[PDB]
Amino acid sequence: KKILIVDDEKPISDIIKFNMTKEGYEVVTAFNGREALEQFEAEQPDIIILDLMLPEIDGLEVAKTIRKTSSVPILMLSAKDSEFDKVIGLELGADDYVTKPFSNRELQARVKALLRRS
Amino acid sequence: KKILIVDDEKPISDIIKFNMTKEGYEVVTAFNGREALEQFEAEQPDIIILDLMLPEIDGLEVAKTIRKTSSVPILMLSAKDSEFDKVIGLELGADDYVTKPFSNRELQARVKALLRRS
Numbered sequence: 648k649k650i651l652i653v654d655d656e657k658p659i660s661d662i663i664k665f666n667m668t669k670e671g672y673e674v675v676t677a678f679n680g681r682e683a684l685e686q687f688e689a690e691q692p693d694i695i696i697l698d699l700m701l702p703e704i705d706g707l708e709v710a711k712t713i714r715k716t717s718s719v720p721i722l723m724l725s726a727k728d729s730e731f732d733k734v735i736g737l738e739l740g741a742d743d744y745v746t747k748p749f750s751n752r753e754l755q756a757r758v759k760a761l762l763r764r765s
Numbered sequence: 766k767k768i769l770i771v772d773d774e775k776p777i778s779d780i781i782k783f784n785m786t787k788e789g790y791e792v793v794t795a796f797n798g799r800e801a802l803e804q805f806e807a808e809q810p811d812i813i814i815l816d817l818m819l820p821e822i823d824g825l826e827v828a829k830t831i832r833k834t835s836s837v838p839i840l841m842l843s844a845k846d847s848e849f850d851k852v853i854g855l856e857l858g859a860d861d862y863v864t865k866p867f868s869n870r871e872l873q874a875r876v877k878a879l880l881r882r883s
Contacts, residue, residue, distance in 0.1 A: 720882075730870055733868075733874070734868075734870050734871055734874045737874040737875065737877070737878050738874055738877075742878055742881075742882060743878070750848040750851075752848055752852050753848055753852055753855075756852045756856055763860075764860060764882050764883065
């Protein structure tokens, strides 16, 4: 399956890409909101890992515009960890929300759980 | 929709029941693993909130036996918060895993996210 990793930090994108690759996923990456939407239309990923904090267009808007056309599972990832952040992420259409820093194993498990359910 | 709350602590069951009721869910409760499986068969809940730590049969076994027959969404809830706990919960079939103590608003949001997806 194909995962789109949307993260404006290259070190973190690289770590997620490495671990998702190691599991047998095809990985596409985007580094801002605009690239996220372009990659989403062009690549039709099976799941999207989406950070809230993005150049050009923020993660919340990315998720909101994606949901206008698609039920693709979205796992939001963010260093922001307050109740409000988690709640608004999910209500705007994320299927899950994981905080940074994260466990690589938990992330893999959550990606699988999401894929199992769509 | 109907939520089965499986929790061996009555104060916590009561809080979840209160807040899920306030949202318009029908609530059924179980206080151990055996009651969980009985309520699951008899009531056919739309979602199950399941703590790991249960009398008679533990939460991990509850989730594992449920999955033999049912794709019903399971949200695991536990004071245990390590990587291992979260990972094994999810791999044994939970759709999500939230730690105690939890935000009532985040829990509501996660229940909705799960229901949206099944």
